[PDB]
A paper describes a structure:
TRPM8 is a multimodal sensor of innocuous-to-noxious cold that is activated by several factors, such as temperature, cooling agents (e.g., menthol and icilin), voltage, pressure, and osmolality. TRPM8 is a non-selective cation channel permeable to both monovalent and divalent cations that is activated by multiple factors, such as temperature, voltage, pressure, and changes in osmolality. TRPM8 has attracted great interest because of the therapeutic applications of its modulators that can be utilized for several pathological conditions, including neuropathic pain, irritable bowel syndrome, oropharyngeal dysphagia, chronic cough, and hypertension. At 2.7 Å resolution, it is one of the two highest-resolution structures of any TRPM8 protein that is currently available. Overall, human TRPM8 adopts a characteristic homotetrameric arrangement and is very similar to previously described TRPM8 structures.
We determined a cryo-EM structure of apo HsTRPM8 that was solubilized with lauryl maltose neopentyl glycol (LMNG) and cholesteryl hemisuccinate (CHS). By combining a high-resolution global map with focused refinement maps of N-terminal domains, we were able to build an atomic model of human TRPM8 (HsTRPM8) that comprises residues 43–1104. The pore is composed of helices S5 and S6 connected with a pore helix (PH). The lower gate of the channel is formed by hydrophobic side chains of M978 and F979 (both shown in Fig. 2a as sticks) that close the pore. In contrast, in our reconstruction, only the first two amino acids from the selectivity filter (F912 and G913) are resolved. The conformation of the pore in our structure is similar to the closed C0 MmTRPM812. In our structure, the S4-S5 linker is parallel to the S5 helix, and the S4 helix is fully α-helical. The quality of our EM map in this region allowed us to unambiguously assign them to two CHS molecules and a phospholipid with one monounsaturated fatty acid which we modeled as phosphatidylcholine (POPC). In summary, additional densities visible in our HsTRPM8 (and other published structures) can be interpreted as compounds copurifying with the protein (PE/POPC, Na+) or used for its solubilization (CHS), but we cannot be sure about their identity and source, and thus interpret their physiological relevance. Importantly, we did not observe any density in the putative Ca2+-binding pocket between the S2 and S3 helices that could be assigned to the divalent ion, which further confirms that our structure is not in the desensitized state. To improve the quality of the reconstruction of this region we performed its focused refinement, followed by C4 symmetry expansion and subtraction of the signal from the rest of the TRPM8 molecule.
Numbering used by the authors:
A (entry chain A): 865 to 891, 895 to 913, 952 to 984, 990 to 1008
B (entry chain A): 145 to 229, 235 to 240
C (entry chain D): 433 to 533, 557 to 716, 722 to 891, 895 to 912
D (entry chain D): 961 to 984, 990 to 1030, 1049 to 1056
E (entry chain A): 577 to 624
F (entry chain A): 481 to 528
The structure:
């Protein structure tokens, strides 16, 4: 669940990044939506006073997304045998009731 | 009916006696009892009145506590104000 | 018997029903028990008919604060006022200055005993105070402030121990109060009086960082009741969200309320609930982001179209909210590094509006578009931060808050290393101060990424 | 060598970022929760963007300008 | 409740049903003291 | 020597659940049924 939430937040950031790229690079609602959705995913995985804020917002995005990932990694430790035994019973009884 | 006849003056507010009389007043309230003490504002009677007032303040929705104070008219200090001029006497 | 601290002998012989005495007959003996630190005798005289409120006259308090006040304690108080000043510290300093050169005399005596770390005397005096939870919390705050002075670490440790003791006392007393009554305890929670600087139980607990008092179930459910407003917490969250999206369903009885009224009080109570207001603000922020994206992608034609003016008005209301946050939080607002981001995003929006208003200029229009895209990224980052905080609003908030600062420091160190790497590359590859600075700053970021 | 040293120091800083919250329980996060929720509850509690009217009214007003509980306690 | 439960026929089932009912009643936030008492009784009957 | 099974008649149970049942407890039970309903909660509500 934690990694799923982190990936959802990354997808929201990717949508924002695609909107920004389309507003910067380019100037057809379906074409605009397709470009916004599929531009950052293909780009990442395949002008004087704007560079410093660009670096700053990249740093802020890295900070928030990395913190979400670390929360995903470490959140299960916040909140012993009985819990996992209950979960084991739940799963095994769910399969045995078929 | 509880007839409390104790020290008329110079009552030590020891924790044991405080607890004893608080429990007594609580029992009287729970059982719907009357407490017959003296009307004087001294010693044990003063503490009984204080505990009765505290119980009434704490539990307003519970049963009221009856604390009859049987005193002597010949020993009341600030008299001449209890006589009628419906009428409320400011003691 | 008092000079030798023989309490049992005094109780057995002096104070007996056979003997007679008056409350005013032991005034001087009470004074000398107070100044000689005989808490048992203070308690004995208090429970033997003496009235503390009438005994604590202005002359008695002045003598206690002038002649029987430690000079080391006064020096520590002065150091605290100069270095760790606070509202309660200022109030106590003013009180001490008044008594050195209603009025709550019992509070003054309690402060006199608290400042000098007279633990048992302070407990005896505190048992006679009117607002006892407030007195305990104020003592905890004052003692925690005095523990900050490093002139004498033994005195600071004693102050910290006494502060913990009084915090525990306040917690236990308020737990008893809440177990007895819930509405009366909550009235006592927000009770304010000029006794402790016009402060409050919750305010004093927060200022003193009394985590045990704040973490009380009574305080926590009081906060939950405040958060839900007039909406009962027994209603489901999805029901509240659905009534938020479907406004007419609020008056149809879908959402239960704590109290009862006119078909207008229901909507007023619903839409003034902090839970509802928060959810509505998040929804309207998402809608504003959608409008921003629409304007950027399809409504940029070198003239402000009505969507642009609507977006400008929404940003103006956001700026008003940010100004209110500035005014409320003072200079401490620009410490979270995420409030700074919101302020900088609003300023960047203002700059982009200025650039965009300069029509008949392709360069100005392109600069405005680029600034607006960067600000769209900033606003979505703010929404992502809101989502992150709301998801981890619980035991994981500590980890989240620590991780944010730690990753920020790591990224700052990476930026320092990147500046060094750019300087090295420029000194190796290349041989105009502005051009050199631009190359140094923007070479490693483009090269590595 | 300097690339290895830079990787070492930056990676150690990242790992410190990951693991530092564990060095130093319910009361702490409850206090933080109270702080955040009380900070939000202390606002005007007017839905956006209708809060601008409340702000204007407040600024206009600014420009123009017990024993029972204690006994129970 | 303990005295009555000592007389029940299905005692484990009664204890588990009491635990379930008390945990459900502890969800009501109208009175948190009553909810806490219900939670404590539910834990006691689960232990039983 | 008293037998609880025979003592617990329908009249006794009705008097206990009608006159000696707290109104606050009944309100909490109603809130639970409306908000945190369950199979056992429904069964207990029907019994009451
Ligand atoms: C850039 C382009 C424009 C932007 C587009 C962005 C789109 C974003 C749109 C939507 C995503 C919203 C995500 C919010 C996540 C944060 C909240 C969270 O985790 O906690 C909540 C998760 O429970 C929910 O609030 C579930 C929300 C489900 C929404 C389903 C899709 C709706 C469309 C609730 O937490 P909890 O612990 O259950 O609360 C305590 C419960 N208690 C009070 C009873 C004690
Ligand atoms: C478009 C609007 C109209 C109604 C809205 C829905 C109304 C109610 C909800 C329930 C809501 O769920 C909760 O808040 C549950 C929280 C919880 O119990 O943890 C999530 C958003 C959602 C699906 C809304 C999503 C956006 C919708 C579909
Ligand atoms: C416009 C479309 C895309 C729908 C968007 C829906 C969200 C904006 C809503 C749906 C459910 C809402 C949540 C429902 C419940 C809560 C719990 C609520 O209580 C707390 O966590 C406060 C702290 C605490 O009480 O412990 C805080 C708001 C939050 C996260 C809400 C935040 C806003 C959410 C995610
Ligand atoms: C755009 C700035 C990137 C800085 C370095 C981020 C490193 C993240 C490592 C995650 C394992
Ligand atoms: C330039 C030397 C690089 C060595 C490997 C570094 C790997 C770092 C992994 C961080 C997740
Ligand atoms: Na990134
Ligand atoms: Na990342
Ligand atoms: Na490197
Ligand atoms: Na690295």
């Amino acid at each position: 669940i934690d990694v799923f939430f982190f990936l959802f937040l990354f997808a929201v950031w990717m949508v924002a990044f695609g909107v920004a790229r389309q507003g910067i690079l380019r100037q057809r609602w379906r074409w605009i939506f397709r470009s916004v959705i599929y531009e950052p995913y293909l780009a990442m995985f395949g002008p004087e006073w704007i560079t410093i804020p660009l670096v700053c917002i990249y740093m802020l995005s890295t900070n928030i997304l990395l913190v979400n990932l670390l929360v995903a990694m470490f959140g299960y430790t916040v909140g012993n045998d009985q819990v996992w035994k209950f979960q084991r019973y739940f799963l095994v009884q769910e399969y045995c009731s078929r | 009916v509880i007839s409390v006849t104790g020290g008329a003056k110079n009552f030590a507010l020891k924790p044991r006696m405080r607890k004893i009389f608080s429990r007594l007043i609580y029992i009287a309230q729970s059982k719907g009892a009357w407490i017959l003490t003296g009307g004087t504002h001294y010693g044990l009677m003063k503490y009984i009145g204080e505990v009765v007032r505290d119980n009434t303040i704490s539990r307003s929705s519970e049963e009221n506590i009856v604390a009859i104070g049987i005193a002597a008219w010949g020993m009341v200090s600030n008299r001449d104000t209890l006589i009628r001029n419906y009428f409320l006497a400011q003691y | 018997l008092l000079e030798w601290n023989q309490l049992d002998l005094a109780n057995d012989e002096i104070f007996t029903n056979d003997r007679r005495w008056e409350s005013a007959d032991l005034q001087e003996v009470m004074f000398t028990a107070l100044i000689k630190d005989r808490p048992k005798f203070v308690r004995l005289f208090l429970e033997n008919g003496l009235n503390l409120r009438k005994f604590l006259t202005h002359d008695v308090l002045t003598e206690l604060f002038s002649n029987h006040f430690s000079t080391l304690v006064y020096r520590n108080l002065q150091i605290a006022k100069n270095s760790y000043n606070d509202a309660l510290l200022t109030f106590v300093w003013k009180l001490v200055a008044n008594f050195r050169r209603t009025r709550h005399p019992l509070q003054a005596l309690f402060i006199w005993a608290i400042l000098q770390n007279k633990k048992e005397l302070s407990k005896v005096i505190w048992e006679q105070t009117r607002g006892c939870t407030l007195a305990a919390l104020g003592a905890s705050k004052l003692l925690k402030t005095l523990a900050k002075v490093k002139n004498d670490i033994n005195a600071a440790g004693e102050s910290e121990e006494l502060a913990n003791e009084y915090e525990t006392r306040a917690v236990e007393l308020f737990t008893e109060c809440y177990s007895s009554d819930e509405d009366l305890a909550e009235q006592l929670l927000v009770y304010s009086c000029e006794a402790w600087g016009g402060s409050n139980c919750l305010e004093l607990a927060v200022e003193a960082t009394d985590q045990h008092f704040i973490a009380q179930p009574g305080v926590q459910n009081f906060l939950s009741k405040q958060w839900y407003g007039e909406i009962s917490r027994d209603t489901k969250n999805w029901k509240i969200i659905l009534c938020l999206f479907i406004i007419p369903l609020v008056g149809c009885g879908f959402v239960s309320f704590r109290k009862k009224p006119k078909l207008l009080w229901y909507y007023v109570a619903f839409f003034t609930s902090p839970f509802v207001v928060f959810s509505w603000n998040v929804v309207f922020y998402i809608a504003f982001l959608l409008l921003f994206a629409y304007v950027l992608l399809m409504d940029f034609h070198s003239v402000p179209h009505p969507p642009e003016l609507v977006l400008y008005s929404l940003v103006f209301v956001l700026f008003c909210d940010e100004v209110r946050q500035w005014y409320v939080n003072g200079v401490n607002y620009f410490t979270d590094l995420w409030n700074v981001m919101d302020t900088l995003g609003l300023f960047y929006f203002i700059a982009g509006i200025v650039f965009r208003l300069h029509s008949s200029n392709k360069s100005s229009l392109y600069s405005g578009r680029v600034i607006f895209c960067l600000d769209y990224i900033i606003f979505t980052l703010r929404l992502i931060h809101i989502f992150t905080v709301s998801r981890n609003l619980g035991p994981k908030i500590i980890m989240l808050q620590r991780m944010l600062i730690d990753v920020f420091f790591f990224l700052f160190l990476f930026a320092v290393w990147m500046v060094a790497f750019g300087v090295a590359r420029q000194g190796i590859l290349r041989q105009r101060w502005r051009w050199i600075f631009r190359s140094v700053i923007y070479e490693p970021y483009l090269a590595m990424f | 060598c300097i690339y290895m040293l830079s990787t070492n120091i930056l990676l150690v800083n990242l790992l410190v970022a990951m693991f530092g919250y564990t060095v130093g329980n319910d009361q702490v996060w409850k206090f933080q929760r109270y702080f955040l929720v009380q900070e939000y509850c202390s606002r005007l509690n007017i839905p956006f963007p209708f809060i601008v009217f409340a702000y204007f009214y407040m600024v206009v007003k600014k420009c123009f300008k017990d024993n029972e509980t204690l006994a129970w306690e």
